[PDB]
Every structure is written in C-alpha cells, then in structure tokens.
Amino acid sequence: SQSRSAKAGLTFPVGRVHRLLRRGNYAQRIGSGAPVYLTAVLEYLAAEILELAGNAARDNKKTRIIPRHLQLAIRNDDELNKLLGNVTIAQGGVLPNIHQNLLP
Amino acid sequence: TRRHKSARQLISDENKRINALLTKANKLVPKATYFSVEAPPSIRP
Amino acid sequence: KAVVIDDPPLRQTPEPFDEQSAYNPQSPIAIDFGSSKLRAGFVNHATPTHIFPNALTKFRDRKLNKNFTFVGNDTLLDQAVRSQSRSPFDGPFVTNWNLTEEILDYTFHHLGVVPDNGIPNPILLTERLATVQSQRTNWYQILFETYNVPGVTFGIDSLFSFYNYNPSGNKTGLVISCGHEDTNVIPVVDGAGILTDAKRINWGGHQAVDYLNDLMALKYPYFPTKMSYLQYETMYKDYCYVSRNYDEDIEKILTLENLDTNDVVVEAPFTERVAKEEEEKKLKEQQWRETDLNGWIKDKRLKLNKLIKRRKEKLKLRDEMKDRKSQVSQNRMKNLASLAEDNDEDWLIYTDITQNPEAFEEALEYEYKDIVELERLLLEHYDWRNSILHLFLRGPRPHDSENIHEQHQMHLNVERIRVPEVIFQPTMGGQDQAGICELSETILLKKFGSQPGKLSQTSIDMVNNVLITGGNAKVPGLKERIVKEFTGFLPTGTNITVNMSSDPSLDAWKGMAALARNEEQYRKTVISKKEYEEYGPEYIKEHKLGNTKYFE
Amino acid sequence: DNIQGITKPAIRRLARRGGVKRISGLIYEETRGVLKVFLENVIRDAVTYTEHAKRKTVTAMDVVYALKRQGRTLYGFGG
Amino acid sequence: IYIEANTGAVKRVGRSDAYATEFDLETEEYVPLPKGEVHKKKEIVQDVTLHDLDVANARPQGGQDV
Amino acid sequence: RKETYSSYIYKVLKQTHPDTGISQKSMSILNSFVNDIFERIATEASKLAAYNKKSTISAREIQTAVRLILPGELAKHAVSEGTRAVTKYSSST
Numbered sequence: 001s002q003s004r005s006a007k008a009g010l011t012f013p014v015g016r017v018h019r020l021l022r023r024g025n026y027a028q029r030i031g032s033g034a035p036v037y038l039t040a041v042l043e044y045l046a047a048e049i050l051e052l053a054g055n056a057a058r059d060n061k062k063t064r065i066i067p068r069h070l071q072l073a074i075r076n077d078d079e080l081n082k083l084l085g086n087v088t089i090a091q092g093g094v095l096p097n098i099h100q101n102l103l104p
Numbered sequence: 105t106r107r108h109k110s111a112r113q114l115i116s117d118e119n120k121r122i123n124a125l126l127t128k129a130n131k132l133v134p135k136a137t138y139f140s141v142e143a144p145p146s147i148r149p
Numbered sequence: 150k151a152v153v154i155d156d157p158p159l160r161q162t163p164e165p166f167d168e169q170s171a172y173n174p175q176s177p178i179a180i181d182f183g184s185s186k187l188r189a190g191f192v193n194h195a196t197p198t199h200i201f202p203n204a205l206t207k208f209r210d211r212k213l214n215k216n217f218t219f220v221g222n223d224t225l226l227d228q229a230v231r232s233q234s235r236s237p238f239d240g241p242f243v244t245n246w247n248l249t250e251e252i253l254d255y256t257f258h259h260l261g262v263v264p265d266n267g268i269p270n271p272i273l274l275t276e277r278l279a280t281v282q283s284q285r286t287n288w289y290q291i292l293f294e295t296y297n298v299p300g301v302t303f304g305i306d307s308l309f310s311f312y313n314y315n316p317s318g319n320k321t322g323l324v325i326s327c328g329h330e331d332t333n334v335i336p337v338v339d340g341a342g343i344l345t346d347a348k349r350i351n352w353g354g355h356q357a358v359d360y361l362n363d364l365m366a367l368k369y370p371y372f373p374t375k376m377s378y379l380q381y382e383t384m385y386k387d388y389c390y391v392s393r394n395y396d397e398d399i400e401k402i403l404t405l406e407n408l409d410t411n412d413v414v415v416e417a418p419f420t421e422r423v424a425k426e427e428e429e430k431k432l433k434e435q436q437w438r439e440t441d442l443n444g445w446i447k448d449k450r451l452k453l454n455k456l457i458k459r460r461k462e463k464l465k466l467r468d469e470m471k472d473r474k475s476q477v478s479q480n481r482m483k484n485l486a487s488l489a490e491d492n493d494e495d496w497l498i499y500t501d502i503t504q505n506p507e508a509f510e511e512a513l514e515y516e517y518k519d520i521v522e523l524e525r526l527l528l529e530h531y532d533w534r535n536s537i538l539h540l541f542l543r544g545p546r547p548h549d550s551e552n553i554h555e556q557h558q559m560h561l562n563v564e565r566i567r568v569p570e571v572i573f574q575p576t577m578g579g580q581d582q583a584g585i586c587e588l589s590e591t592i593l594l595k596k597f598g599s600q601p602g603k604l605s606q607t608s609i610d611m612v613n614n615v616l617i618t619g620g621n622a623k624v625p626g627l628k629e630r631i632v633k634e635f636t637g638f639l640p641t642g643t644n645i646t647v648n649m650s651s652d653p654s655l656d657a658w659k660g661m662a663a664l665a666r667n668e669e670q671y672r673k674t675v676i677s678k679k680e681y682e683e684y685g686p687e688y689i690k691e692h693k694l695g696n697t698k699y700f701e
Numbered sequence: 702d703n704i705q706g707i708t709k710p711a712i713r714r715l716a717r718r719g720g721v722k723r724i725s726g727l728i729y730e731e732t733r734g735v736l737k738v739f740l741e742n743v744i745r746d747a748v749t750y751t752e753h754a755k756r757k758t759v760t761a762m763d764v765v766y767a768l769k770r771q772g773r774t775l776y777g778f779g780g
Numbered sequence: 781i782y783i784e785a786n787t788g789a790v791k792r793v794g795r796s797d798a799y800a801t802e803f804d805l806e807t808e809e810y811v812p813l814p815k816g817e818v819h820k821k822k823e824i825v826q827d828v829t830l831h832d833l834d835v836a837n838a839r840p841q842g843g844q845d846v
Numbered sequence: 847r848k849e850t851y852s853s854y855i856y857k858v859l860k861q862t863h864p865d866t867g868i869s870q871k872s873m874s875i876l877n878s879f880v881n882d883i884f885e886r887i888a889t890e891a892s893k894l895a896a897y898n899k900k901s902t903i904s905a906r907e908i909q910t911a912v913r914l915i916l917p918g919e920l921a922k923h924a925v926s927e928g929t930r931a932v933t934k935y936s937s938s939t
Contacts, residue, residue, distance in 0.1 A: 008935035012854050020884070026892035026903060033905030033932050038887065040931035041912055041924050042880060046855050047862075048920075049876070054863035055479075059486040064867040070875055072489060076482060077473070079917035087882070091871055096488050096499070103500050109283075111240040118281050122699075133701050136344040141279045143348045146576075146583040149802045396797075641817065746914070753910045754898055766897075770914075 005039070012039045012046075052077060067091045151414035151558055154380050160225040167198060167261035178260070179273040179661035181306065182249075184238045185329040185354070185620065187221065188658045189256050192665040197658045199259060204234035205248050220255040232377075241277055241330045246287055250295065267297025271675065273661040275306045278333055278347060280696065286686045293681050302674040304695040307335055308342050309660025310618040312694060314648065315340070316663055318670060321607065322614030323592070325585065325631075327621035329353045332572055334588050336611060338597070341693040346596060348588045351580050352571055354621045358385050360578060361568050365559065368542070374417045374557060384561065385568065388413045391626035392566040393633065395573070402563055403537060408545040413565070417557035438530045445530035453523035460516045467509055569624050586634040594638070604640065612639065615647045620654040664694065704733055743767055789846070851880050887911050905932060 004014040018035040052073035057065050059072075071092030075081050118138060126134075134140060181188035183203060190197030201221030208217035208230060219226070224234045237248040257268065272292070276285070285303070292298050307326040312318060319340040326333045330353040336343050362381045366372075392398045401407050438445050469477045484502055533539040533547060542548075544560050571578040572585055583591075593612060599605045604612070612635070617628065628647055635645050650656050665671060674692045681688065689698050712732055716724050746767035747759050754763070761778045768775050782791040794811040855876050859866065868876075890911040895903045909928070913921050 004935070007938055008931050010931060011857055012851075017884070021888060021903075024888065026888050027895050027901060029902035031902060031904035033936070034891075034903055034908055036931055036935045037905045037908045037912075037928045038884070040928040041887070041908075042883065043858070043931075044924050044927045045883060045920075046876065046880060047858055049879070050855065050859045051862065053872075054859070054866055055482065056486060057866060058863075059483055060490050063865065064869060065872045066869055067872050067875060068489075070872060072486060076485060079920055082917050083915075083920070090875065095485075098499065100500060100503070103496055106246070108244060110244055111242050114242055114281055114283060118283070121282070125700075134699055135701050136279050136347075136697050137699050138279045138281060140345075141347055141349045143350050143575075143582040143588060145581045146587050148587070149799060749910060749913060750897075753894060753906070 004036070008036045008039070010036070010039050010043055012043050014039050017042075049073065049080070052080070068093055071095070151416040151554075153416040153418060154383055155418045156228070156231075156377065156379055157383065159228070159231070160222060163226070164199075164201065164222040164259065166259040169261040169263050172261045172263060174269040176270060177273060177300075177665045178268075178270045179658055179665065180253075180256070181275050181658050181661070183275070183306075183329065184236075184241070186654070187252070187256065188655070189260065190658065191260070192662055195659070195662065196655070199256060202234075203236055203238070203252070205237070205252060206230050206233050206235070218251065218255075220252055238330075242281065242284060243287075246291060250291060253296075267295075269297075269299070271300030271302075272298055273665060274301065274303055275309065275657060275661075276303045276696065277331075278305050278307075278335070278344070278349065278696070282687070285689075289681060289686045293678060299678060300675040302676065302695070303690070304674070305335070305342070306657035306660070307333060307618060308337070308694045309658075309664070310653075310656035311337060311616055311660070312340075313656050313660035313663050314616060314650070315614075316667070318667075318693065320614060321610040322616055323589070323611045325589075325615070325617050325619075327353070327572065327617075327619035329620060330355055332585065332619075332621075334585065334592065336592055336597075338607060344697050346592060348592075350572065350575055350582050350585070350588075352575060352578055354385075356578065357568055357571065357621075358382050360571065361385050361389075361564060364564055364567075369559065372417075372557075372559075374419060376417070384415060386623070388561050389565055389568050389624060391569045391624055391630050393626065393630060395566065395570050398566060399563070402566070403540050405534060405540075405545055408540060408562060411562065411565070412544045413561040414544065415559040415561065416554070417559065419557055434526075442530050446527055449523060449526040449530055453520060453527055456516065456520045456523050460513070460520060463509075463513060463516065467513075569627075573630075586631070586638070589635070590638045602640075604643065609643070613644055613646050615645070617647060617649045618653045618656055622649060622653040704737070707733070707736065743771070746770060851877050855880075887915055890914060 005011065008014065014035045017038050018030070021030055021034060021038070049070075053065055053069050056069035056072040056076075057063075060066075060069060067090060071089050072095070073080070074084055074089070074092075075095050115138070122134070122137060122139075126132075177192045179188075179190065179192060179197070181197075185203065187199070187201055187203050188197045189199045202224070204221060204224050206217075206219045206224055208219055210217065219230055224230055235248065237243050237245060237252065243249060257264070262268065262270075274288070276288075288303075289301070292301055306328075307324045310326075311322065311324050315322065317340070320337070321339055322337050324333075324335040324337060324342075326335070332350045332352055333347060334349075335347045358378065358381050361384065362376070362378070365376070365381070402411070434445075466477075469475050470481075472478060481502070484498075488499055488502070533543075539548070541562070542560065544562065549555050567577075574584055575582045593599065593604070593608050594601050597605055597607045597611075599608045615631075615635070617631070628649055632645060632647055635647075636643075639645070664674075674690060674694065676688075676690055689696060691697055709729075712729070713724070743764060744759065747764045750763040750767060751757070751759050756763075765775045765778050765780055769780070774780075782793060783789070794809045797810045797812050800810045852873060856868070859868065887908065891903055891907045894907045894910055895901070900907075909925055912924050912928070915921075916924055
C-alpha cells in the first residue's frame with residue numbers, strides 16, 4: 001500500500017534504517033519504534049544543518065552550497081561545534097580569528 | 105492453595121470467560137456485567 | 150500562623166470483646182466488609198459494636214522469635230505496627246483470602262461467640278455491584294466450608310442504606326453512593342434496584358488522597374521531609390470542600406482579597422596629587438550636600454536612574470545575544486561572513502566582534518558597583534503581588550528563603566476545590582467517563598419512558614426521593630452543588646428533595662439490621678446449605694436488594 | 702559552606718601531588734569551578750545510566766562505565 | 781437565542797460557554813447562560829402620535845426591514 | 847545499486863531554500879555526517895541494550911542514547927520531535 005515514512009510523517013526512509021539496523025549486528029531483536037525514532041532524529045539533525053548552511057550560503061550572496069558555508073555553519077554554532085569538535089572537514093578552511101594584542 | 109490472582113488479570117479472565125460464552129451462544133444478550141456497568145464517555149467537550 | 154499536622158494520635162485502650170453469656174446461637178450477625186473499614190455487630194442492636202480499619206500485621210519479635218497477629222484497632226498501638234499494616238483488598242476486589250479468614254476469626258473471637266463445628270449464626274454480607282464470578286465463588290467456598298454457616302445473603306450497601314431510610318421496601322428513588330474506591334448511581338423502582346441502568350465511576354477517596362499527594366509532590370519538588378498517607382488524609386479531610394460553581398471560582402481564587410481568607414498554611418513537623426584631588430572632590434561634594442541636599446539628591450537620583458537604564462539595556466543586549474534565531478545573531482553572522490567572504494577601522498571592527506562572555510560579566514559587575522555608588526550618593530544627599538506564581542506557592546505574604554520554619558510550610562489555595570471536583574469532571578483525574586450530574590441527567594431525562602421535555606411519573610418519583618450515601622459524602626457543599634445542578638437541567642417547578650444522613654458511613658449496617666429485624670422479607674434472600682449443594686457455586690439469588698444474573 | 706567541604710589543605714595536597722612548589726593565594730575559585738563541572742558531567746551521565754536501569758541508587762558500575770564513555774576509564778571497581 | 785412571543789422576533793445572542801472548548805480557536809463568540817427564568821412577562825405603555833401612523837402608512841419606497 | 851541519502855536531504859533542503867543547490871563535495875559531507883551519527887547512536891543503543899541483560903533494542907534505549915550523545919538543547923528538541931513522530935506512527939487508526 002503506502003510506506004511507513006508517510007505514516008509517521010517523515011521524508012527519510014524507515015524500512016531502509018530498519019534494514020541497516022537489522023544485519024548491523026547491534027542486537028538480535030529490534031523493536032518497531034526504533035527506526036521511526038532514529039528517522040525523526042536524523043530528520044531534525046539534517047534539517048538544522050541545512051538551515052544553517054542555507055543561511056551561510058545566502059550570507060555569501062552565492063546561490064549554491066559550498067563546504068566553506070558548511071564550515072561557517074558548523075563553527076559559528078555553539079553546540080553543533082560541540083557535537084562536531086572531533087571531525088575534520090573537507091575543503092572548509094578556518095574561521096578568521098586574530099588575537100587582540102597582535103593588533104597594534 | 106491458590107495462586108495470587110491480582111486485580112489486573114481478574115478483569116482479563118472475566119471478559120475472556122464472557123467472550124467465550126458469547127461466542128458459544130453465537131454458534132445471548134448480557135444484562136448486568138462488570139463492563140456494562142461502566143460509565144460511558146461524556147458528550148460535552 | 151501555620152497549623153502543624155502530624156500522624157494521627159495512637160489509641161491507648163486496647164479493643165475489648167463482648168461477653169459470651171449474652172451470645173445466643175440463633176440471632177443473625179451482620180458484617181460490612183468494606184475496603185476502608187469493617188463494621189460488625191449483632192442484629193438486636195441499632196449501632197454496630199465493632200468498627201475498626203481493615204488491616205493486619207504479621208508482627209515479628211526479635212527476642213521471642215514468634216510471629217504475632219494484630220488486627221484492626223490493635224494495629225493502632227505502635228507507629229511501627231501502624232506503618233506495616235496490610236489490607237486484604239487490591240483495588241475494588243479481594244486477592245488473598247488467608248488475610249480475610251484471619252480477620253474473620255479475629256472478629257468472631259471479639260463478638261463473644263462460643264461455636265461448635267463452625268458458626269451457627271447466619272451472616273449478612275455486602276458485595277460490590279456486578280461482582281466477578283470468582284469473588285462470589287470464593288466467598289461461597291470459604292463460608293460454606295470453613296465456617297459451616299446455615300444462611301448467606303448478598304447485597305449492595307447502597308441498597309441497604311436505601312432500605313434503612315425507606316423501610317417499607319417498595320419506594321422509588323435515586324441512590325448516589327461515594328465509596329472508598331468507586332462512585333455509583335443506582336436507580337430504584339418500587340424498591341427493586343434496576344441494575345441494568347446503574348453506572349459506576351472509577352474514583353473514590355483513595356484516588357482523591359493519591360491525587361492530593363501527587364499534586365503536593367509536583368508543587369514542592371525540594372521539600373525536605375517525606376509525608377505519609379495519613380497526613381495527606383488529614384489535609385484532605387480538613388481543608389477540602391466542593392465549590393458552588395467551579396467554572397467561575399478559579400477566576401477569582403488567586404486574587405489578593407480572596408487569598409486573605411481562603412488560604413491554609415500547613416507546617417511539617419520537625420526538630421599624592423590624585424589623592425589630593427579626590428579629597429578636594431569629596432570636600433566639594435560634602436559642601437554641596439550640606440549646601441543643597443535636595444538638588445544633589447535629585448542629581449544623584451537621575452544618575453542612578455541613568456545607570457539603571459544602562460544596566461537594563463546591557464541585560465537586554467545580553468539576553469538578545471543568547472537567542473540564535475534573533476536578528477542580532479543574524480547580524481553577527483553577516484559581519485562574520487563579511488570578514489570571511491570578500492585598514493585600521495576594519496581591524497578595530499574585527500577586534501570588536503570578538504566574544505565577550507566574561508567581559509560582559511565584569512562590565513555588569515562594574516555597572517552594579519557604579520549603581521551602588523549612585524545609590525550611596527542619593528542616600529548621602531519585582532513586586533511579588535504581580536506574580537501569580539508567587540501567590541500560587543507562598544500565598545499573599547512575602548517569603549523568606551532563609552527561615553527554617555518557612556522551609557517546611559505548605560499552602561493550600563487551589564487544591565481545596567480542585568481535589569473534590571473530580572467526581573463531577575472525571576477527565577481531570579484521567580478517567581474518560583461522564584460526571585455525576587451527566588449520568589443523573591441521562592438517567593432521568595432519557596430513560597424509564599421519559600422523552601426529553603416531559604417527565605414520566607417514575608422520573609418524578611425518582612427526583613422526589615434522591616438519597617446521598619457513602620463515606621466520601623463528608624465533603625461540605627456536596628448537597629447544595631447537586632441540588633443546583635439538578636434544578637439546572639430539570640424542567641421548572643419540579644420538586645427536588647435530596648436526603649443525606651448525619652453520618653453517611655453507618656447507614657449500610659443499619660440497613661442490614663433493619664432487613665434482619667423484618668422477618669417477612671428476610672426469607673427471600675437467604676441461601677441455605679442445601680441450595681449451595683444443589684445448584685453449586687454458580688448461583689445468583691434474584692431479590693430486590695442484591696445482584697442479578699449476567700444474561701437474559 | 703556548601704562548596705566549602707573541600708578546603709585549603711586538600712587542594713594544597715592535590716597541587717603538591719601535581720609536583721608544584723609555589724601556589725597562588727587565590728587559585729581557589731577556578732579549581733572549585735572545574736571540580737564542580739567535572740562532578741556534574743560524571744554524575745549526570747551516571748544518573749542517566751541508572752535511570753534507564755530503573756535503579757534509583759547510583760552504583761559503582763554505572764560511574765565506571767560513565768568514565769569509560771568519557772575516555773577516563775577506571776580499573777578495579779568492576780568492568 | 782431570544783424569542784418574543786407576541787411579535788415573533790428572533791435574535792441570536794451567541795453560542796453558550798458550555799461549548800467553549802470544542803476548539804482552541806473559533807469565530808463564534810461565547811456568552812454565559814441566563815440566570816433568569818426562560819419565561820418573562822411585562823406590561824408596557826406605548827405612546828404614539830397621529831403623525832407617526834401617518835408616516836408609517838405613507839412610505840413610498842416600501843416597508844423596510846427591522 | 848550504490849546506496850546514498852541524496853534524494854531525501856535534497857527534498858528537506860527544498861522545503862526551506864528552493865533556489866539553492868548543493869555541491870558534490872558538500873553532498874558527501876552530509877552523507878558522511880548522517881552515517882556517522884547513525885553509527886554512533888546505534889552503537890550506544892546496542893551498548894545500553896547489553897547493559898541490562900536485554901536482548902531487544904526498543905525506542906527507550908534509543909531515547910536514552912540520544913539523551914547521552916547530543917548536547918542539551920539539541921537533545922530536548924530531538925526527543926520532542928521523535929516522541930511526536932512515534933505517537934503519530936503508533937496511532938495509525
């Protein structure tokens with residue numbers, strides 16, 4: 001009939017993450033609310049990152065999403081930086097920071 | 105010697121006995137059981 | 150002044166027993182097996198001779214190594230034996246029958262009975278409305294086997310109280326009973342309870358005290374003392390009443406003039422040139438304060454007001470910077486990307502765009518010191534009444550956090566009328582059921598051949614004989630509220646009579662005594678030993694005061 | 702007197718176990734602060750671990766697995 | 781509602797406040813119940829002039845609505 | 847059939863920024879980020895399932911793992927949205 005993603009009101013797939021949880025040998029039994037909970041969490045995280053990336057891309061006055069905008073969105077935000085304080089970025093650059101006494 | 109038979113499963117075996125009797129009778133009408141006495145939900149908001 | 154609650158005081162005199170000389174083996178004996186209290190006594194009296202809570206302890210002595218047994222009023226002797234009391238009931242039903250057998254042995258000993266091969270007296274017993282078959286099976290088994298009783302009758306305590314207040318046995322009325330664990334509405338036609346139209350709400354005194362305990366736990370999450378069930382029962386018994394109109398009382402329950410009279414406070418029980426210039430400036434300021442104190446005080450007040458406005462603007466800026474969705478954060482991101490996408494002034498702008506979490510705190514401390522200096526210069530030359538939350542916790546008085554007595558205080562302002570309202574609106578307690586007035590309305594206006602708009606004679610006789618019983622009818626304002634609702638939905642000119650006894654918890658036993666004293670209609674309800682041996686435990690005696698069969 | 706349970710000889714001993722010789726006279730408060738944040742991280746994780754286990758006392762097993770989550774794993778008190 | 785027995789005029793005051801929580805946001809205004817009785821009776825005196833009847837019977841466009 | 851999350855984050859970008867495009871390196875950033883979050887949350891849920899002698903992973907373990915992984919405001923918003931999605935899915939009647 002119809003998929004479970006529209007049944008739970010999501011755009012990310014549910015059977016796909018159910019499959020990836022199944023033979024990923026995390027456990028031999030998996031409940032039914034597990035893929036919809038994981039799907040909603042991934043929805044919110046991707047939507048937040050895409051919001052900040054689109055704001056940075058518009059802030060550059062440039063109509064595509066370039067990883068410099070991703071770096072700006074990751075490091076400008078507080079707890080997104082806390083979540084991603086370990087991962088190195090591809091083609092992102094470094095936020096501009098000069099220490100105060102080097103200015104004469 | 106009896107099992108403990110707490111209050112949650114007394115309702116369960118009672119309505120399963122009622123359903124068994126009703127399905128036997130279908131293959132009748134209740135008068136005053138524990139579930140017909142229960143108050144219906146209200147019709148005002 | 151806050152009143153102090155505690156545990157109820159312990160009983161001193163132990164429970165006595167009746168003399169065995171006055172016992173005769175032919176009089177019946179009435180037993181009211183209640184979920185909250187036990188009422189037993191002989192038929193020839195008007196009041197029961199034994200009233201005690203339905204409780205039992207298996208007392209263990211460390212020294213004598215003997216399992217003791219304290220039942221009822223004997224459990225009201227020590228705090229430790231009071232706290233470990235156990236009831237045979239679990240919800241509206243009975244689970245373990247060994248406790249019931251022990252309690253029945255206790256109350257048979259205290260009645261001065263000398264038996265032989267069981268009890269020779271027939272018993273009178275109460276039962277729940279539409280009881281499970283297992284319950285009556287177990288009752289038949291324990292009576293007719295362990296006690297050798299000749300006769301047993303079963304009935305509902307509401308119909309017993311109705312028979313007590315209508316001894317002719319053929320009247321027509323409406324019964325409302327507020328029990329310990331449920332509330333029932335039973336219509337009575339010609340003295341016979343119409344059990345196909347009775348209704349039940351799953352709410353009683355026990356759920357009400359649990360509701361009050363949960364509300365008090367959620368209201369004061371840092372209360373340092375643990376409160377017991379009996380203390381919450383005393384607060385429920387003392388300072389709870391039914392409002393005349395709940396829909397408009399909550400609009401004015403938290404005004405200041407209403408909180409002066411309708412607030413209860415409950416106390417828990419417990420046991421060189423710069424220095425010369427500064428000195429010259431201080432001397433000039435002292436000379437100006439001695440010369441013109443009013444103008445200097447006005448200028449210092451204006452400076453303090455300007456400092457307070459600057460501090461408020463700084464706090465507003467600090468709060469606005471904390472919001473990621475604010476326009477200030479968007480402007481900060483625009484300036485940051487403007488330093489990251491495309492001079493000494495731009496260098497100073499980049500220096501000024503740095504994060505200042507601790508610098509803002511240091512500047513706020515400096516501004517607070519400047520405001521303190523401005524207040525000192527003004528001296529030299531946030532209202533809790535607008536806070537609904539402060540009125541909700543701490544009432545109409547100012548609160549001291551450092552007071553040890555105020556740390557154990559508890560206020561009852563909204564909970565005096567919120568707790569008893571659940572029997573009228575069961576959705577507040579979590580039960581998806583109609584209220585008392587709704588069930589009475591759909592009984593009186595759409596049943597017994599009464600179309601909505603005109604009342605049949607049965608409905609008129611029902612309205613004219615409304616009786617309120619049960620132990621939970623002790624709440625004030627209940628009768629007036631029911632009368633107001635009843636005259637709300639009925640046609641005009643209808644006569645409404647509502648009867649409530651002085652003690653609505655002892656009318657059931659008086660109903661047993663009145664039925665046993667009336668010899669003629671006794672024998673329609675008694676079940677003999679031969680009856681149980683013939684038709685088995687699956688047997689329902691149809692009469693005007695008891696249960697009916699499950700089917701048609 | 703709430704935070705004042707730990708005191709001057711205690712953090713003098715701790716700094717001496719750091720092998721330092723001269724301390725400052727008001728290094729007190731930032732050490733008290735990092736003390737506070739380390740404990741509230743560790744027992745917040747321990748409280749969540751014991752909340753999911755329906756165990757309303759905090760056990761040793763929960764806090765050593767809280768540290769092993771945090772990368773500061775302890776040996777000897779289970780594992 | 782409001783019903784006059786002699787004239788037949790019908791005026792809708794508004795929805796009762798017992799149905800105030802059927803929705804969170806609504807176009808309908810909510811009014812309380814009458815504390816009075818349903819049936820009310822009163823005697824009044826009317827004062828008219830001959831010019832009032834003259835101008836009531838001599839409307840040239842037609843009898844307007846209430 | 848090499849499998850990737852490209853279409854789904856294409857639409858959830860499209861419901862808020864219609865006139866915006868994604869580069870392929872950026873496309874890979876979001877794909878790797880989603881897979882890393884999935885791996886971290888799932889291995890924490892499996893560890894918490896093995897904590898309590900429990901052979902089944904349900905929604906409560908993943909809620910506890912989400913409360914363990916994320917920082918606080920992200921955590922409370924994630925459990926709010928996930929609880930709303932679970933109650934939407936369960937009441938499919």
